[PDB]
């Protein structure tokens, strides 16, 4: 029902990969965890959930973001789920932008996708329950992500404000109802009635937010997807309009890659630590 697949010592702590049978997705799922050195002492540690973007697995961030150094110092565990259901019986598309690697963190209502594409319930309900049951962790959590995963973090935090201390993102999809990535995925997973899409749009949620989760967003100015897919100005406008605690930082010359993420991940860890320690 749960299997440790791999272990690698990392900055006096541990990077470990698991597979488990998901009740919400009705499929096997892989996730990775980083436990800091403090978890070896008897301490319970807080958890940063990291959600990845299109095509990614539970490996990309663990390998490339360089988060382990500071997570170790600050005593933060990081949990990185995969980006979609995977395996036998799970629908898929040949394109990188739909199906596997592309769950969009929604609960799909349209067949065939509705059978397995319940990534919102997985991230919000099943995964944290599992993590808290297995690992030496507290009930204090935060959430972050990149692009589709930034969309994931923001939308989940805004709809579950009591559940998350803080939220952050790199290159988030802010207004997915108004971009091709969001439109393709939402039409396929949720159908043609865009009223059903509203609860999955960070910019729309933020404008209407009744309770604040502190937020930090970093955007590379040389990100090729900025205008068409990401639309940070649209998030800023929502924040402005709702007195929302959003710090949105634009960085000249930086792109959409993990090189950009690695460049500011320590900022994100110090930001989360501020709220996870409270
Ligand atoms: Cl993405």
Could you give all domains of the chain from N- to C-terminal order, each with its CATH number?
A: 1-278 (3.40.50.1820)
61 backbone dihedrals φ, ψ, rounded to 5°:
-65, -45
- Look-up: residue for tokens 């950009």? 260
Count of CB atoms situated within 10 Å of the CB of 208: 12
CA distance 133 to 137: 9
**Ligand 1 center to residue 84 CA distance, Å?**
12
**Ligand 1 center to residue 79 CA distance, Å?**
19
* SS3 state at 176: helix
Q: Which residues are catalytic?
A: 147, 223, 256
**Ligand 1 center to residue 6 CA distance, Å?**
26
Is omega for the bond preceding 176 within 30 degrees of 0, making it cis?
no
- Look-up: residue for tokens 């029902």? 1
User: In terms of C-beta density within 10 A (0-12 exposed, 13-18 middle, 19 or more buried), how is residue 220 classed?
Assistant: buried
27 backbone dihedrals φ, ψ, rounded to 5°:
-165, 165
CA distance 278 to 272: 10
**Ligand 1 center to residue 275 CA distance, Å?**
26
Q: Do 30 and 56 contact (CB within 8 A), yes or no?
A: no
241 backbone dihedrals φ, ψ, rounded to 5°:
-70, -25
Q: Do 262 and 64 contact (CB within 8 A), yes or no?
A: yes
Count of CB atoms situated within 10 Å of the CB of 222: 13
* Separation of CA 46 from chain center: 16
Element (H, E) at 129: helix 127-134
CB neighbours of 187 closer than 8 A, spacing ≥ 6?
Answer: none
First-residue to last-residue Cα distance in the chain = 34
Q: Do 82 and 105 contact (CB within 8 A), yes or no?
A: no
- Look-up: residue for tokens 């403090």? 38
Q: Do 29 and 86 contact (CB within 8 A), yes or no?
A: yes
**Ligand 1 center to residue 228 CA distance, Å?**
12
User: Distances from the Cα of 130 to the Cαs of 31, 59, 133, in angstroms?
Assistant: 11, 19, 5
Report the structure determination method: X-ray
* Separation of CA 186 from chain center: 17
What's 208-276 look like in SS3? HCCCCCCEEEEEECCCCCHHHHHCHHHHHHHHHHCCCCEEEEEECCCCCCHHHHHHHHHHHHHHHHHHH
**Ligand 1 center to residue 16 CA distance, Å?**
24
């Amino acid at each position: 029902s749960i299997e440790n697949l791999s272990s690698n010592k990392s900055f006096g702590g541990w990077h470990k990969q698991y597979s488990h049978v998901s009740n919400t997705l009705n499929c096997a799922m892989r996730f990775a965890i980083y436990l800091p050195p403090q978890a070896s002492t008897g301490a319970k540690v807080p958890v940063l959930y990291w959600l990845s973007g299109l095509t990614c697995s539970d490996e990309n961030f663990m390998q490339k973001a360089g988060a382990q150094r500071l997570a170790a110092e600050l005593g933060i565990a990081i949990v990185a789920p995969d980006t979609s259901p995977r395996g036998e019986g799970v629908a898929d598309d040949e394109g990188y932008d739909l199906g596997q690697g592309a769950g969009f963190y929604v609960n799909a209502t349209q067949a065939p996708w509705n059978r397995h594409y319940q990534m919102y319930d997985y991230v919000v309900n099943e995964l944290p329950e599992l993590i808290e049951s297995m690992f030496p962790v507290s009930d204090k959590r935060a959430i972050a992500g990149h692009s589709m995963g930034g969309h994931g973090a923001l939308t989940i935090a805004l709809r579950n404000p009591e559940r998350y201390q803080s939220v952050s993102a790199f290159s988030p999809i802010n207004n997915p109802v108004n971009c091709p990535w969001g439109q393709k995925a939402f039409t396929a997973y949720l159908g043609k009635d865009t009223d059903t899409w509203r609860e999955y749009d960070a910019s729309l949620l933020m404008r209407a937010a009744k309770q604040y989760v502190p937020a930090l967003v970093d955007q590379g100015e040389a990100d090729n997807f900025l205008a068409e897919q990401l639309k940070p100005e649209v998030l800023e406008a929502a924040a402005s309009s709702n007195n929302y605690p959003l710090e949105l930082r634009s960085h000249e010359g930086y792109d959409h890659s993990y090189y950009f993420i690695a460049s500011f991940i320590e900022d994100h860890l110090r930001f989360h630590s501020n709220y996870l320690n409270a």
